[PDB]
């Protein structure tokens, strides 16, 4: 229904997301993701950490460099969690991934554009109150990542550039809600009410 | 046994509800053991006081509806640390020795019950000047 879909991971889960992401990419629906650093995962920080550690050691015994690349950036966590939900040695699986890009936060050419949410994959709906979850940015840096401060820094920048835009827009609509109601009570409008408008 | 002991209490209750034509429901709140005991020796003349569980009291008085039907109105006054001073002497005498003498204020008289009649204890202390205004003005 759209050419491109920007998706915020904030409040999301990695598993439930990438599934509904994967089957969209193989159908051509171009995706792109933001605020990957702020994903959530069930279980406490410790289990979601150790499970990385058990994977962290798993390595080609005789030459570590051709073994499992253990990326730590939350981007390439969600990526891997996506790739593993794909037959990714075929070309179908490859073009599926040029259809996708994942970022931390929200770079310029995507920040002034809408981004969305996936109700199937929400902590706040899918996951019960009273269970421990785990942010990813706490973890990626706990296993090699660096730039948690940078994103929190570069993020707070735009959010100021955002709030400008919002309240600049907010009053601009209350302007509309005024100059429209003078026409709301018009015979033109009374017809539209007769037709569902 | 234990319930028979609750029953042992009920006996003296009914014993004095009937053995005495009157009973002064007196407030045993704040009455010390030396104060309740000194209530006896002065009451050893006529009155006998009987203490227990108010729940046992009402549950005792709740069982005397076949005969002694007028005892139904003792239950609303079985409240707080209050108890009956079963007695047969005139009103002002036991009323004064209960409330005035050997009082640490301290027990008052919650209610004076006799022959299905209820008194607020206020006019009971009327010594004089009440009948003169009624007999003269009438």
């Amino acid at each position: 229904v759209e050419p491109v879909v920007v998706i915020d991971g904030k409040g999301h889960l990695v598993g439930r997301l990438a599934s509904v992401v994967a089957k969209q990419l193989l159908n051509g629906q171009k995706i792109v993701v933001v605020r990957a650093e702020e994903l959530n995962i069930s279980g406490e920080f410790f289990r979601n950490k150790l499970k990385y550690h058990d994977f962290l050691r798993k390595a080609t015994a005789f030459n570590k460099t051709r073994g499992p690349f253990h990326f730590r950036a939350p981007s390439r966590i969600f990526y891997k969690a996506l790739r593993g939900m794909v037959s990714h040695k075929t070309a179908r699986g490859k073009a599926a991934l040029e259809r996708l890009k994942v970022f931390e936060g929200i770079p310029p050419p995507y920040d002034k554009k809408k981004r969305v949410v996936v109700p199937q994959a929400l902590r706040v709906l899918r996951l019960k109150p009273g269970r421990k979850y785990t942010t990813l940015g706490k973890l990626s840096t706990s296993v090699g990542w660096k730039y948690e401060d940078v994103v929190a820094k570069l993020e707070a920048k735009r959010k100021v550039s955002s709030a400008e835009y919002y309240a600049k827009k907010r009053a601009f609509t209350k302007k509309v809600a005024s100059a429209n109601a003078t026409a709301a009570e018009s015979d033109v409008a009374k017809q539209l009410a007769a037709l569902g408008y | 046994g234990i319930r028979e002991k609750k029953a042992e209490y009920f006996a003296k209750l009914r014993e004095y509800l009937e053995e005495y034509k009157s009973l002064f429901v007196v407030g045993v709140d704040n009455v010390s053991s030396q104060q309740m005991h000194e209530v006896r020796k002065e009451l050893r003349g006529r009155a006998v006081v009987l203490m227990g569980k108010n729940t046992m009291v009402r549950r005792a008085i709740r069982g005397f509806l076949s005969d002694l039907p007028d005892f139904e109105k003792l239950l609303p006054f079985v409240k707080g640390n209050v108890g009956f001073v079963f007695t047969n002497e005139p009103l002002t005498e036991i009323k004064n020795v209960i409330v005035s003498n050997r009082v640490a204020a301290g027990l008052t008289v919650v209610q004076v019950y006799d022959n299905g009649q209820v008194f607020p204890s206020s006019i009971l202390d009327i010594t004089d000047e009440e009948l003169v205004s009624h007999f003269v003005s009438a």
């Binding site: 509904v20 969305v116 949410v117 109700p119 929400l122 709906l125 | -």
Partner: protein, 172 residues
Amino acid sequence: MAHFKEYQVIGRRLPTESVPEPKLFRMRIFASNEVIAKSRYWYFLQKLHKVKKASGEIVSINQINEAHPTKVKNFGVWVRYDSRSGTHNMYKEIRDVSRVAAVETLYQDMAARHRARFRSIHILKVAEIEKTADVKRQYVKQFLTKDLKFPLPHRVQKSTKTFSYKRPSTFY
């Protein structure tokens, strides 16, 4: 193991010249179909008397409608059943509207709290009570209070589509 029905089932040992007019036996049985209600009849009649499927006959097989299927009712259930290590009995209660769903709820409970299946479980007795305060559990008494109220928070909007355009709410 379905949406159940309560059947009344009557059978007797097969008559002969020896005993015309045998002694019928009624049972209030729970299942999906009248077929099974004949089966478990013989399953129990065995245990109680010297008979079988073959020396016996059904005299009648009827479904029971519920007498008052909107009257919410506190149902008390004596029960027997079996475990991995032996046989057990119970008395357990539900507040619900029919004897039927009161059991359709039961087997699911038993199949999660003690891991029993229809084959292991026997039902013994099912009773409405005339007066409150005859109850013995608490999660039932939780609902018998005057002027009772309570909320249902964390309303969730199971979406039709996949995507959205709003971090939703749950105020309800």
